[PDB]
Design a protein around this ligand. Sequence first.
Ligand SMILES: CCOCCN(C[C@@H](O)CN1CCC[C@@]2(CCc3c(ccc4[nH]ncc34)O2)C1)S(=O)(=O)c1c(C)cccc1C
Lengths: 10, 318
Amino acid sequence: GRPRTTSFAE
Amino acid sequence: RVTMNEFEYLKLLGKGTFGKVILVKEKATGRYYAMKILKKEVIVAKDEVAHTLTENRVLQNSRHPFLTALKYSFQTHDRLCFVMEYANGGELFFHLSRERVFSEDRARFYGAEIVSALDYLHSEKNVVYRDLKLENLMLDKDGHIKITDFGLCKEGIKDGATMKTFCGTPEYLAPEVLEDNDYGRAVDWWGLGVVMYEMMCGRLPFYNQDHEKLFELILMEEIRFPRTLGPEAKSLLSGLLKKDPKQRLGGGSEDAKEIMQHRFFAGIVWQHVYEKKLSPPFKPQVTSETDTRYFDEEFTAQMITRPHFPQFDYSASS
Ligand SMILES: CCOCCN(C[C@@H](O)CN1CCC[C@@]2(CCc3c(ccc4[nH]ncc34)O2)C1)S(=O)(=O)c1c(C)cccc1C
């Protein structure tokens, strides 16, 4: 299903 | 205790912007581990230093059946290395990329183990995890959950204490975080809700490729419920995906205790969950110690090739 996601912080 | 040369480098498990994870064997013990190898220059360049040190502390300080265990940390001139227990089952993301939907029983089993782990993080460690997602959830050789990737954790967070950092994974961000409000530990139950939704429904509850459209859905749209979903599953998902954290299941003083009591979990003896006395729904089917069938061929088919991080180096004891 969905593409791999990416963790982040601002 | 250890260096780069105490290990054999067998199979690439994954690779990203910050480095790679390699299935390794400890020369002295014959034991297999997963070594996360991060590029110091990238970590510095992306301002990831405090996250890496946070992941290190949280891993060191935690002991739980459903949290990934750390054996060694050390560093080189240009590298940071975490030697963690190897989870031959890969990511939940791997499995849901192939199955599409788990049964309610199977989703309940993983959900109970995740609750067990987050309850421990909140209650015992005063930690809020903040990055629950299919990619950060692994299965060990017996089919039990292992949470990974503690770099986004908030430490020293008690009961209702609040947090400010805009962080996590866009698809999984809770409404109160998108509202630019101070938020508490109930963000973790939102993340549990999105993961349970994905497991039982086979899609994210909110999705657009565009982040602004995605964030709008999260803030504005009620969740849809596939007609296959039973009433207690619907109720659980509905309660975990309450947009107001004060109304969310687990959003009060009792935290995880409120989720544990929910009728979706009616079969479940929580002490048996912790003691791992409940039969896993899936046991990874491996033919050897080095069978990496639950990691993407894209990675496993590949051949293997400035500052001091203070107080990073570590070796486990008991
Ligand atoms: C402080 C910021 O660094 C962190 C940012 N990265 C995030 C990754 O850690 C995501 N993880 C999510 C869970 C699975 C991975 C790979 C397999 C694995 C572990 C952890 C413990 C394990 N035990 N057994 C296997 C195993 O990590 C990658 S990454 O994006 O660079 C990256 C990706 C996508 C893929 C592979 C390696 C890396 C480093």
